[PDB]
Design a protein around this ligand. Structure first.
Ligand SMILES: *[C@@H]1O[C@H](CO)[C@@H](O)[C@H](O)[C@H]1NC(C)=O
Ligand SMILES: [Ca+2]
Length: 476
């Protein structure tokens, strides 16, 4: 599927080993500290698609599928998929090639997309870097194909970042020489084959900043689908330019201010507001980026605060910002794990409650976003517009005039005071009746133009023209 095809999507990102076992167990042990394979499979995912689609997601992103180093290392098993050894084989832990194709067709039979995580930067090896036996890797079975061993000593040196090895001497990550024509052609041919063999709709590309830029356009083209890159850097001036060589990148620039804005009652709404504008302007296309506040490479949101109302606000933002929302399996169950491997909790241990607070929050927000898109072909291309802020509040507007969604978000928390906010800028016609689609109440636009927004318990508010909801299953 195309970048255009992807704008309207919203992604549930999951760890294949950790989302759902074939046996459907909700009790199967998974001590994250043990870093072992816990049992999750592609077929397990298939059996839980009702749970995923019931939150209003239109796609999933799954961890890499290539066969991994087999050893149980001092850092555990390759359960996450980032330590590949044989790229023309699948990781048997998740099932068979038929299983992967089954997941793909099952997603498609529901009108959903499959996104797959891929690594081009490196392989994985159990052992010291200098001692690597290259013969294990397929097809890159000789030192020939790799950058000479060295570690990234200085991250300000972009040449070191690209030419030296990630990892360490316990689990080393032999770094492919992605400037060699033979390496390019092998990867380019592989990625097209992968996508065709399994009917893959999109790619999430790992460790993008660790590969020289002139590698990516050819890779993206070969893939023949939307590619969104992990560029692990919070500076828009470093990260957005990668969108010049690749369809999208994950929105790490928004990530930091977003997290700070909502992780405490004293978070800076100013930084968030500004970053939205900086990204909107200086990024080739903000609507092709992916928004998230939680993933497998950072502490989970709920690890910073257990305030449910804060979690509600940051989730609403992810869904309603420009670009593609990305929610990380477990976030909807208020998972609170810290840094790797604590943030790789098995989803099945939650019991998959479909009536939990954040599950319902996310369903409501996706419901409106999805509806708005079905009516307003200009929604996805309309660049989100921050219209208001204060010390505890931010409001924003997205959608063609007369059909816009206006979102008011707060970091007051669950003990926030009741009160009324007068909102200038919404651009609704005076006396117009609007629905608040989370709590399902109504409000009328003032004559002064302003909107009388009832604020209570630090809850999120999402407004949308009541007449426009006609015939939707929203708020019945
Ligand atoms: C795609 O299918 C062909 C033929 O079955 C196979 O040889 C090739 O290895 C597959 N490509 C990938 C990336 O697995
Ligand atoms: Ca590299």
């Amino acid at each position: 599927a195309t970048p255009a095809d992807w704008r309207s999507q919203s992604i549930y990102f999951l760890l294949t080993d950790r989302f759902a076992r074939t046996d459907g167990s909700t009790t199967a042990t998974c001590n994250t500290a043990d870093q072992k394979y816990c049992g999750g499979t592609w077929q397990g995912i298939i059996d839980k698609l009702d749970y995923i689609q019931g939150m209003g997601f239109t796609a999933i992103w799954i961890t890499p599928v290539t066969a991994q180093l087999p050893q149980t290392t001092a850092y555990g098993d390759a359960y996450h998929g980032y330590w590949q050894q044989d790229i023309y084989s699948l990781n048997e832990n998740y099932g068979t090639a038929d299983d992967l194709k089954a997941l793909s067709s099952a997603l498609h039979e529901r009108g959903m997309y499959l996104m797959v995580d891929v690594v081009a930067n490196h392989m994985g090896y159990d052992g010291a870097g200098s001692s690597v036996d290259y013969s294990v890797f397929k097809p890159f079975s000789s030192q020939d194909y790799f950058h000479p061993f060295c570690f990234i000593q200085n991250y300000e040196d972009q040449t070191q970042v690209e030419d030296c090895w990630l990892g360490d001497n316990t689990v080393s990550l032999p770094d492919l020489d992605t400037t060699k024509d033979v390496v390019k052609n092998e990867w380019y041919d592989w990625v097209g084959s992968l996508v065709s063999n399994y009917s893959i709709d999109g790619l999430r590309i790992d460790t993008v900043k660790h590969v020289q830029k002139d590698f990516w356009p050819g890779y993206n083209k070969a893939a023949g689908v939307y590619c969104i890159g992990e560029v692990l850097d919070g500076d828009p001036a470093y990260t957005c330019p990668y969108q010049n060589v690749m369809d999208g990148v994950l929105n790490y620039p928004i990530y930091y201010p977003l997290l700070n804005a909502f992780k405490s009652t004293s978070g800076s709404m100013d930084d968030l507001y500004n970053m939205i504008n900086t990204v909107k302007s200086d990024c080739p296309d903000s609507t092709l980026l992916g928004t998230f506040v939680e993933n497998h490479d950072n502490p989970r949101f709920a690890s910073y605060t257990n305030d449910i109302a804060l979690a509600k606000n940051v989730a609403a933002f992810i869904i309603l910002n420009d670009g593609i929302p990305i929610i990380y399996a477990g976030q909807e169950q208020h998972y609170a794990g810290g840094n790797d491997p604590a943030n790789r909790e098995a989803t099945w241990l939650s019991g998959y409650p479909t009536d939990s607070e954040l599950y319902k929050l996310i369903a409501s927000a996706n419901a409106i976003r999805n509806y708005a898109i079905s009516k307003d072909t200009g929604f996805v291309t309309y660049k989100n517009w921050p219209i208001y802020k204060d010390d505890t509040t931010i409001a924003m507007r997205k959608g063609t005039d007369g059909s816009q969604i206006v979102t008011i978000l707060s970091n007051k928390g669950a003990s926030g005071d009741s009160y009324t906010l007068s909102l200038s800028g919404a651009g609704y016609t005076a006396g117009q009746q609007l629905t608040e689609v989370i709590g399902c109440t109504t409000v009328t636009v003032g004559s002064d133009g302003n909107v009388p927004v009832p604020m209570a318990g630090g809850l999120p508010r999402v407004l949308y023209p009541t007449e426009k909801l006609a015939g939707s299953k929203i708020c019945s």
